[PDB]
Design an enzyme around this catalytic site. Structure first.
Site, short mmCIF file in Angstrom:
data_model
loop_
_atom_site.label_atom_id
_atom_site.label_comp_id
_atom_site.label_asym_id
_atom_site.label_seq_id
_atom_site.Cartn_x
_atom_site.Cartn_y
_atom_site.Cartn_z
N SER A 157 0.82 -1.21 0.00
CA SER A 157 0.00 0.00 0.00
C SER A 157 0.85 1.26 0.00
O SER A 157 1.47 1.61 -1.02
CB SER A 157 -0.95 0.01 1.20
OG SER A 157 -1.69 1.21 1.27
N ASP A 194 -11.06 -2.71 -3.27
CA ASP A 194 -10.24 -1.95 -2.33
C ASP A 194 -10.58 -0.48 -2.51
O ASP A 194 -10.62 0.01 -3.64
CB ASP A 194 -8.74 -2.21 -2.57
CG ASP A 194 -7.84 -1.44 -1.61
OD1 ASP A 194 -8.00 -0.21 -1.45
OD2 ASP A 194 -6.95 -2.08 -1.00
N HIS A 214 -10.71 -13.96 1.69
CA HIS A 214 -11.70 -14.56 2.57
C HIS A 214 -11.10 -15.56 3.55
O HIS A 214 -11.58 -15.66 4.69
CB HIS A 214 -12.79 -15.25 1.74
CG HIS A 214 -14.14 -15.24 2.39
ND1 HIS A 214 -14.90 -14.10 2.52
CD2 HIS A 214 -14.88 -16.24 2.93
CE1 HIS A 214 -16.04 -14.39 3.12
NE2 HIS A 214 -16.05 -15.69 3.38
#
Length: 624
Positions: free
Chosen positions: A463, A549, A594
């Site tokens: 990120s 996102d 997940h």
């Protein structure tokens, strides 16, 4: 207190929620809140309390559980994935567990042992993202709720916290730099709250109670220095605080465990970490002997009034359990349960000489039996923004690397908060070039000190860390062979000036407002990787991008991949004859991850990409 254990917990892969109270262990066993015996007989013996379907939500899981002292009720925070809302549900623990309430948008909540022998629930939520309310809910005579506080500043968070002795309930109005604490009488919660001290801009303080004396962690007077202070509960004004324990400059208070006669304080200064036990009545101050291989704590914000459990870990060694055995003299290693990671590891705190002449700490650590003549591949990490420290949690995908001979490096460049606010003040958008001035010098110091060569040097980012990663690819690409990016952040300017619909609350205070400022256009254009893409030779890139996102635009990085391919092609077309075009991969993965398997198999896709661009056979034998 910046990254405090109660602050950061209310500030990748799922974490477990397992609250033990009154001889029972509360958790979910298939979206269904259950309670099992203190030590589970079988993995199937448990009492069903509440099924998570009864809320009609999508993929709900438990966030935290708080148990009433009577155990007549239990409050649980239901929070779902791919969403933003939550629900604090309250179940009546009778011979037939039934739900009697469910409050939405609740941030934090605690139970209060009441003088009238009635479980009292305190909770907090935001009214239209505008300001916080604090209510009081009871379920015996059905007194409904009662707003008794309403913090009116949208820029201020509000979280509740109960002192370990359950004497006071702290209503903590907080800002990044300013805090203000109120007190609820744990012996009579219906009395109005008592303001300890009206907020003072720049002064943070967190309040714990022990024996009619308020112990207060604060940075009053000097923000760079934190310190412990005492005061009587009857006279809690700031003019009544006496200094009790002094911390060094730029230390990071990461937990405070208050006990019946002492106070344990978990700290972190530079990259070194400390824990010390401070006597309350007596002047006892002993700093425990920490092993050198440890690079981070793992705190559990639940403890008994006579033992201080904590847990040490590094990116290579799995967490090891410890406890200040209070009545004795502190135990450590649980049984003989230990891993021989230390037999050959080399946890070395080193420093780098930046271009502007400032010591940049970086942690490097590898196998010592690895013969010195040859050089093994080097994988460095970086973040250097938001004031966050580079995460030293255990990652199994890193142990398998060092076991295969790899050299790991953790570059704590400016922008992060390893050296304090001073370290974070630098390396921000107005001075982000210092973040490169450290990241570049770190790699150069490693190469100059004979660790690895650019043909074997790689780096991974995440990120906000991708900003200093892509910038280095356009700054000095001759120092890296391959790069793996996880939901990276490249076109900072084409995301911020392009202000179609971005919330961008804190990002402005970190990356200045470019859509309405000239200085916030010149400087951001100096390092933004999307704006310094020049047709040259690059390292190989493998982006494990997530489609779902909101902090990272999918366009912002998918457009970066194609513009990167067009730039290398123009550089290829210029010298296309044995140039060896770098492999650039973009593994678009849909939705938030997940399970543990998909993320730990994208791990395999990242490791195989690194072992391909270097050709180091394959040693991927491991558990998960």
């Amino acid at each position: 207190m910046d990254a405090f254990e109660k602050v950061r917990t209310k500030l990748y892969e799922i974490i477990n929620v397992e609250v033990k109270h009154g001889g029972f262990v509360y958790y979910q066993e298939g979206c269904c809140l259950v309670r099992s015996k203190d030590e589970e007989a079988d993995n199937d013996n448990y009492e069903v309390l509440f099924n998570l379907e009864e809320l009609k939500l999508d993929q709900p899981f438990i966030d935290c559980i708080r148990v009433a002292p009577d155990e007549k009720y239990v409050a649980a925070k239901i929070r779902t994935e791919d969403s933003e809302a939550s629900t604090c549900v309250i179940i009546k623990l009778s011979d037939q567990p039934v739900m009697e309430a469910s409050f939405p948008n609740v941030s934090s909540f605690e139970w209060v042992k009441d003088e009238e022998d009635e479980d009292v629930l305190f909770y907090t939520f935001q009214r239209n993202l505008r300001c916080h309310d604090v209510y009081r809910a009871t379920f015996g005579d059905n007194k409904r709720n009662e707003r008794f506080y309403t913090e009116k500043d949208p820029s201020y968070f509000v979280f509740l916290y109960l002192t370990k002795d359950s004497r006071f309930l702290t209503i903590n109005i907080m800002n990044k730099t300013t805090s203000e604490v109120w007190l609820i009488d744990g012996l009579s919660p219906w009395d109005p709250p008592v303001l300890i001290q009206k907020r003072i801009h720049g002064v943070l303080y967190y309040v714990e109670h022990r024996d009619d004396e308020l112990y207060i962690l604060t940075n009053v007077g000097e923000p760079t220095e934190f310190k412990l202070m005492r005061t009587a509960a009857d006279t809690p004004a700031i003019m009544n605080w006496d200094l009790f324990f002094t911390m060094k400059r730029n230390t990071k208070v990461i937990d405070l465990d208050m006990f019946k006669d002492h106070c344990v304080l978990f700290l972190k200064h530079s990259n070194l970490l400390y824990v010390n036990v401070i006597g309350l009545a007596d002047d006892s101050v002993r700093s425990l002997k920490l092993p050198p291989w440890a690079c981070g704590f793992i705190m559990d914000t639940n403890s008994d009034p006579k033992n201080c459990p904590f847990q040490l870990c590094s990116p290579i060694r799995p967490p090891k359990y410890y406890t200040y055995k209070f009545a004795e003299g502190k135990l450590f290693e649980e049984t003989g349960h230990e891993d021989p990671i230390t037999k050959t590891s080399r946890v070395l705190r080193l420093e780098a000489k930046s271009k502007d002449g400032k010591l940049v700490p970086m942690t490097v650590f590898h196998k010592t039996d690895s013969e010195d003549l040859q050089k093994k591949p080097l994988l460095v990490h970086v973040y250097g923004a938001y004031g966050m420290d580079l995460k030293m949690n255990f990652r199994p995908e890193r142990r398998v690397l060092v076991d295969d001979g790899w050299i790991l490096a953790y570059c704590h460049v400016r922008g992060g908060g390893e050296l304090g606010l001073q370290w974070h003040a630098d390396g921000r958008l107005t001075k982000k070039l210092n973040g490169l001035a450290d990241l570049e010098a770190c790699i150069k110091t490693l190469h100059g000190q004979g660790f690895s060569q650019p043909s074997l040097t790689t780096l991974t980012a995440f990120s906000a860390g991708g900003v200093l990663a892509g910038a280095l690819c356009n700054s000095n690409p001759e120092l890296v062979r391959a790069v793996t990016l996880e939901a990276p952040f490249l076109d900072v300017l084409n995301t911020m000036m392009d202000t179609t619909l971005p919330l961008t609350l804190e990002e402005l205070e970190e990356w200045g407002n470019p859509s309405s400022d000239e200085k916030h256009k010149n400087y951001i254009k100096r390092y933004c990787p999307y704006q310094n893409i020049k047709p040259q030779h690059y390292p190989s890139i493998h982006i494990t991008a997530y489609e779902n996102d909101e902090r990272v635009p999918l366009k912002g990085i998918v457009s970066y991949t194609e513009k990167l391919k067009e730039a290398i092609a123009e550089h290829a077309k210029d010298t296309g004859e044995g140039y060896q075009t770098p492999n650039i991969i973009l593994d678009i993965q849909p939705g938030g991850n997940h399970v543990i398997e998909d993320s730990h198999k994208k791990i395999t896709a990242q490791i195989k990409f690194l072992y391909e661009e270097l050709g180091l056979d394959s040693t991927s034998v491991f558990e998960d």
